[PDB]
C-alpha cells in the first residue's frame, strides 16, 4: 500500500479532463487520499522541478506550471506509484505512451502531457511533503 | 455567471464517482473554481443541515467529502439539473447523477446549492477565504 | 429490497447491448441475483405475453434471450426507470435504455416486470428453482 | 422511414463533439445518409434562419459546420428527442445533447429539422442534389 | 471461428464489472454463445485448476473461486481465443497488462485480476466441457 | 502541424463507428479539417491502392472499398500523421494492434480493420490530392 503524488497540470484543466483523470484512477482501484485545486508559488515550482533545475529549458517548465492553478492529489493503494505511471503513459504522448493511457488518448506534445505522477518511492515521499506539508 | 456549492458526499466517494461527477459538470460547460477533499467538523455538518436528523450528521461526518465551487452561466440551475430530483427513483430522471446511480434519498451522492442565497451562504462556510 | 425479472430480448442481443444494459443496472446500485442466456419454448413465450400477437411469439422465440433476476432497493421501479416508457420515441426519455437505443415499440430491446405480482409470477416461470 | 436535416454548429465543433453527436444518432438506430463539413454562404445562413437576428448569421458563418442527412424510422422526432428542448437548462433534459453539454440557447450546439415540411426544404438547400 | 471459455470471477462481480466485461467482448465483434451466473463446486474448482494443482498456493485459488458465484460464458467468433486474451491483458495487472485491457484498466493484483480466458484450443475445449457439460 | 488522410471504410460504417472514430481523433487534440461521406469510383479505388496494385489479392481490396460509401476526412494538427496511426493500431487487429486503439478494440480481421490513415508525409500529400482535389 503506497502513496504517490499526482498533478493535473494547467493543460489538463483547460481541456476539461479533471473528472476524466480522477475517474481512471478510481476505477483502477486506487483511492483519492488528498485532493486540492491550488496555485503554485514560484518557489514551490522550483522545488518540484529542482532535479531538472540545471537542465536546458528549465525555465519554461516553471512558466507553464504557474500560468494557472493545478489539481494536486495524494493517490493511495496497492502499487499506487507504478499503477499511476501505468495509467498516465510514457512521457512522449505519441512515440511512447500507448493508447488507453491518459497521455496516449489525449496528448500530442511532451510539454503538454496533462498529468504528473511520482516516479519512485523516494520522489513521492519528497513531492508529497512539498505539496501537502501537513500530511 | 453564477457560483454554486457542490458536495460529493461520502457515498459518492465510496462508490468511486468523484471523477464521474466532475466530468459531468465540466462537460455541461461549467468550470471548477475551487476543489478540495476535506473532513467535516460537527458544527459545519450540523449548520449545513438546517433542514432522523441525527443519522445525517453521522453520515456527512462519517468520512471526508469533496467540496467544490462550480462557476459559469446559470451554474446553480445547471448543477441541480445534472444532479436530478431528490428521490433518485421517483423524481430524478435517468441521465442525471442521482437518476443513473442512486436508489435512496439518504444516499443520493451529491449536493448542489438550491438558490442564490443558499450558494452565497454555503460557499462562505465551506470556503471561508473565497 | 425487491426482486424483479429482466429480459434482454433478441433485438438487444443482435445490437450488442447485453453488456450495456447490465452495466446500467449495476451502476444504479442493483445486483444481478440470477443471469442466464437461454432459449424460449413456445409455451413460455405465449404465457409470458398474455397482453399482431403472433408476430411477438415469432419474435421472442426467434433467438435466445438473456434472462436475469435483478435485486435491490426498489428494484422493480428502478428497472422500469432505467428502461424508459414503452414507445422509445414518444414516451421514453433520453438517458434510458429505450430512449437512447430504440425507435420501435416492437423492438424496445428489454423487459422489466411491471409490479410486485408480475415479478413474482414471471420469476417463477423463468427461474423455476429460485 | 423519414429523412431529416442535422447541423453541428460551429460551437459543437470547437467543443469537440462531432463524434459524440454522430454516435448518439447511430446508437438510436438511425443512419447517416449524407455527411459533410462545409462553409455557409451568407444567403444560405440568412435563408436558413427565417425565425439579435444578426448575431446569428455572424455565428452560423463564423466557422464551418457539419451538415448531415439522418435517415430512419421516425428520424425527425427521434433527432429532436436526442437533441433536447431549445433552452439547454430550462427545457432540455439531461441525457440529451443540449441537456448534457449546453448552457445557452445561442450555443446549443446542434440543429434538427422540426417537421416533415422543414426537413424537405432544409435538405434541398443543404444537399441540392439529394 | 473458435469457442473459448470466459469467467468473470467473484472479484469482477463485487466490483460491478459484469456489464463492462461483456460489453468489451461484444464490441470486439464476438458473440456470447452461452452465459450463466452459477456457483462453483469444490470439485469443479479443482477440475478447472487441475493443471496448477501441484503448484504452491494452489489451495488459495480454490478458496476464492468458490467464495461467491461466478459468471461463466462461452465466447464465439473469429480468433475468439486470442481476442479474449487480448481484451483481458497479461496476468499481472500492473507489470504486464497494458491499459485499455480489462486487467490494465481495473486491476492491481494478480490474485484479483477479475477475469479468465482459455489459453489454448485444447484448454478451451476441456474447460468448456466442465463448465457447460451439454454444449 | 501536419495533414493526414483518414478513411472510415464500409465496415466501420455498418458497425456504427463513424461517431466513435471521429471522437477519438477529436479527443487526441486533432481537428477535422475536411469531412465527407462519399462513394468511391473504381478508378479512385485503384488510384488509392495503386502501390499494392501488383500484389496478390489486389482485386479483393477494390471490391470491398466500393461495396458501399466511405467517410473521407482530412485530419490536421501536431504530428497528425503519427497520432492517427497511433489511434488506429497495427494492421492485424489481434496480433498487432493494442487494446485502446480503434482496431484493437473493435476488429478481428485485417481485411475488416475499419479505418485507414496515411502512412507517411508523402502518402498523405498524394492521398489527400485524390480524395480532396480542391484542398
Numbering used by the authors:
A (entry chain A), E (entry chain A), F (entry chain A): 2 to 136
B (entry chain B), C (entry chain B), D (entry chain B): 2 to 52, 58 to 136
Task: Copy text verbatim from the article accompanying this structure deposition.
Nucleoside diphosphate kinases (NDPKs) catalyze the reversible transfer of the phosphoryl γ of nucleoside triphosphates to nucleoside diphosphates. The two-step reaction proceeds via a covalent intermediate, the enzyme being transiently phosphorylated on a conserved histidine residue, His117 in Mycobacterium tuberculosis NDPK (Mt-NDPK). Crystal structure of the Mt-NDPK has been solved. It is a hexamer with a tertiary and quaternary structure very similar to other hexameric NDPKs.
One interaction present in Mt-NDPK but missing in other NDPKs, is the intersubunit salt bridge Arg80-Asp93 located on the protein surface. Here, to elucidate the crucial role of that salt bridge for hexamer and overall protein stability, a mutant having the salt bridge abolished (D93N) has been prepared. The D93N mutant crystallizes along two different space groups. The two structures are similar (0.40 Å of rmsd for 135 Cα) and differ only slightly in the conformation of αA and α2 helices due to crystal contacts. The overall B-factor values of the two D93N structures (64 Å2 and 71 Å2) are similar and higher than that of the wild type (31 Å2). Analysis of B-factor reveals that (1) two domains, the αA-α2 region (40–70) and the CTerm part (120–136), are highly flexible and (2) the beginning of the Kpn-loop where the mutation is located appears more flexible in the mutant than in the WT structure. The D93N mutant enzymes displayed catalytic properties very similar to those of the wt enzyme, within experimental errors. In presence of urea, the mutation of the negatively charged Asp93 into the neutral Asn had a dramatic effect on the hexamer stability. : the c1/2 of the wt hexamer decreased from 5.2 M to less than 0.5 M for the D93N mutant. The D93N mutation appears to decrease the protein stability because the negative charge of the Asp93 interacts with distant protein charges and stabilizes the hexamer. The lower contact surfaces between subunits, as compared to other NDPKs, are compensated by the intersubunit salt bridge Arg80-Asp93.
